[PDB]
Symmetry: D3
């Protein structure tokens, strides 16, 4: 799990949450097939609601210009972000995301390599509502400050606990990475961090260009696009 903070500033988050608080919400089951629909009991904006289209586009521009998201996710496709609200006991029980998610009836299709939640509500403003991620050998609970993003592989079973007080607004989306295998992405991420550290401490060292070549030749071997 990668926590990427402050995608939006505090004033931006306040503006976005105010619009979400005043939006006309629809039943969340519309974007789930008949299976995980049994587990989904929240509210969602329609995909092409103008607020969802506007903030989704704003999220994409921020993420494509975030060095941490670019390095760790190596994004190729970002599914148009969806917006949900858990309140009044709303929840999303344990489910796996579909391997391929269609956009506008299959115009674009996104392999769900990575999943993400961007929190638009303060953790003090709702009870429950934790994003619970279950791996093979353990569980992780995530409840981040408003404006922060969590990034985790699409291979995990996850759920959102019921919200028992207040309301939780967030955006969620999937990313198809250039690099499908998470162990390969993390290897590239760690190697890039090492190269960045060496560039600061000892720039102009001839081994840096060759290690950069190694990094990009790995990307050549592994990138699908």
């Amino acid at each position: 799990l990668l926590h990427i903070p402050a995608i939006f500033t505090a004033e931006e988050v306040s503006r976005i949450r105010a619009a979400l608080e005043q939006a006309e919400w629809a039943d969340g089951k519309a974007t789930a097939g008949y299976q995980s629909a049994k587990a989904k009991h929240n509210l969602q904006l329609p995909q092409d609601h103008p607020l969802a289209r506007e903030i989704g586009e704003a999220m994409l521009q921020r993420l494509w210009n975030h060095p941490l998201f670019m390095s760790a996710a190596l994004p190729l496709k970002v599914f148009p972000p969806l917006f949900n609200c858990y309140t009044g006991g709303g929840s999303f029980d344990f489910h796996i995301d579909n391997a391929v998610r269609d956009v506008h009836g299959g115009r674009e299709r996104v392999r769900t390599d990575l999943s993400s939640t961007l929190f638009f509500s303060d953790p003090e403003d709702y009870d429950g509502g934790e994003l619970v991620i279950q791996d093979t050998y353990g569980l992780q609970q995530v409840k981040l400050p408003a404006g922060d993003l969590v990034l985790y592989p699409g291979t995990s079973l996850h759920k959102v606990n019921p919200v028992t007080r207040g309301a939780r607004y967030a955006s969620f989306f999937w990313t198809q990475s250039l690099v499908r295998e998470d162990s390969q992405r993390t290897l590239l991420f760690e190697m890039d961090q090492s190269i960045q550290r060496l560039t600061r401490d000892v720039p102009d060292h001839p081994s840096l260009i060759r290690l950069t070549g190694t990094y990009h030749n790995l990307l050549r071997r592994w990138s699908e696009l």
Copy 2:
């Protein structure tokens, strides 16, 4: 070889075949390059003939909504269906399909993972014309009722026997699957039928969600798009 019956109803097949019988046909060697053109001796509609465009689109809408085709083929791209007529001795001797088929000057290009024939003529309405498929260790002959589709891997050498009486009308196309390797697709197909059977017999069993998670993680590992 997968036989998918009744893509169209009997009344629809009668309408489609009547239009095909009244269409203006061209020499089939147009679509074949100067290698398999020596083996191709049939009639074909031009690719953008309005009948070929109309029934091709109707064909895609039915196939995209057919659970058997969706599960077995896992389609990503469907080449715009071509339409042919074997009559008066027309035939297509043994040939292999090109690995990549270009659409409209290469705007889209389809890797020919799977081949398909949709029969529009009754088997009783023509002699010969069998679709003969030769794998490494044997041969299969296919002559299906009108409205039925045959699906088979693009890796095989195949031919159409001469038509010595009547006329054989059919559509043919290739599919680029999300999953390139046939053994991977069949594993996924078999797994899905097992999960479908368990959902019927014992729904809400907690292992069903996890096996569905397994299926989609395999699709996540194997899907190219």
Copy 3:
């Protein structure tokens, strides 16, 4: 990080630890290459020590008959277990395990797909000594009850904190799995657990034999031996 408890019984662990307390120890910088030897400040038994070979053989027999270890590790090769002691400030600073470890006497070489530590000391009897495993975006600290084993991928930088009070006795080793990729092993492990759960609940269901066939076909696709 998989926790496999009670490899040995509490009585057995006491006998093993008592023997290790009376053993003659060697400087740990004899079995790590000169580089990781800079980070190594602990005690180790020589690989030809009879006590190390005796306990190591007992560990192998237990592990090769342990369903949890067999399923999660899918072992092909197990490097002969080594035994270390951390006491009086002894530690092992951060290091990466060599990808291929040669076994004394030639012949065998083990790809270090999985790492493991079997704890022989009670956690309350020593201070510090935690096994710290560095992830891409996380730290994990491990200090398990005596007789328990931790299994983790060999792809991680790890270390052992200094033991300030008491002594920490343990065995460590590496495993070459049939399945190299950790994401594949966990997928197989999860699938097997789901099948056992279904086998208990609804036996003789025809989907069990087919899903078992799916499991072994995946093992057939992925196993290297």
Copy 4:
């Protein structure tokens, strides 16, 4: 499904069957696991039976000298052949073969890439006893002349129908190929046959040496050993 005829001569087959007719048989439920032993209702020779070891060695010598078996199977390991008898209603209901079979003595483990049955009984001499191999979209039944072998991928559920009259004697085994994937083995097999055909027809052609290099380069890319 590849049929390899006349591994042994007719005279040899009569001697082998006569010896097997006079041998002391054991219950077949001693070689397969619990799940498969439920489906197993036949007779088998113990793996240390001298007749099984003598005939099995004779099978290995013939198979390793057989150009057809060598090319289509590309064998790396052959599991020591086993011998069974189906008579008096004996059968082996549907089952899948374990992906990895351990050889007595502990040292060797065979990935079951390919399955094989060598028939020692005349098909006219017994009723039933068909080897039924279940495909994704088909069923294949095999009942071959005495002395003939069938070679087929280990990825299929298969069974043997009850023998209602007479007795069916056969040998079965598994092969770990150099080339794990069946589509790769068939590609190599077809390519080698084409080269041999060209070698007979137009020898000394400079493209023969280069295509042979292509064949071995593919074997270099795909062979695991």
Copy 5:
């Protein structure tokens, strides 16, 4: 390195060079990210300069209809060709190309499997300016006649030596191949040349269709699109 001569005729090269000589040149550092920009000291046309768009399109059509380029490169994407000029000491020190190059801010993104330079200056018309390609085990210097193309893998470190007299005009671009691995591309290229040679010497041989089938099944196995 593949040398493909006479992409353009002598008269066409003269016309193109005259326009390049009269064009308004900009600093090259624009296309170089902040890294290789320290190594880039030449002149480039803006990407959408009408001369760059016109000749890039003209190169595009010539290459798509060139049998040597189609077979060796197996192109899927061609980055819109860039145009540079080295003069007055201009050079490009050692650098590695980025694995993924974006077109117009990411509408299309090209994996840089292959790199290419098309020379528009006569070697006699400038001093220095050699394209130097450093492999693991050696260096190659390329300085080709005007109108000729060089094709080489994108995995190499390369540079252009300073031009100390005259001026060097050229176009450069990258190609994403259908087949990512260079060893797979060369195997296909060599095998295609063998099949072409056999078709000339002995056409209508039944092994040619099967080897062509082998070639296309390899392309089916390896092509990404």
Copy 6:
């Protein structure tokens, strides 16, 4: 083509060549199979020759302790070195090496990932005898000083030109690498050189241990053993 000089000292080379000059030689066609034997017109020592086994063991001990050979070849298996003599017009026309070579004593089989020739004769002492290696787009000729080794991928057609004056003595062998793919091996080799250069210039840099971890994780991903 990697050139590894001075496997033996000049004094050692003189003793080795002096022994080979006095040894009893055999027809080279006994080793190579037909087709390759058609192109083989040289002398070779039998594999049970004591001089071949003595020098061969000396080569193995030197190579296994040579950092350059260890890094570039990443050897898993080395085929017992063979010894040949070219003189009086003796030659070896173009040929590919078999992908899998069996070692005489049974048991071991070597995938011929890499080829090598150790020169025991001074290049001035014989005319001709060049080792010609044919690439996809070029030819390389090798005639190295006595005691030097050439290492090159096993994927190439190669030959030895006739020796018209003098005699050429050499040892040749194949290596199965831990890493099958040549592009992977060179990537690892280049990465290791970059790490070693950095280790000398800026030791104790925290990026060195992490980059070493990256190297071994790549080795963990790619090594087959």
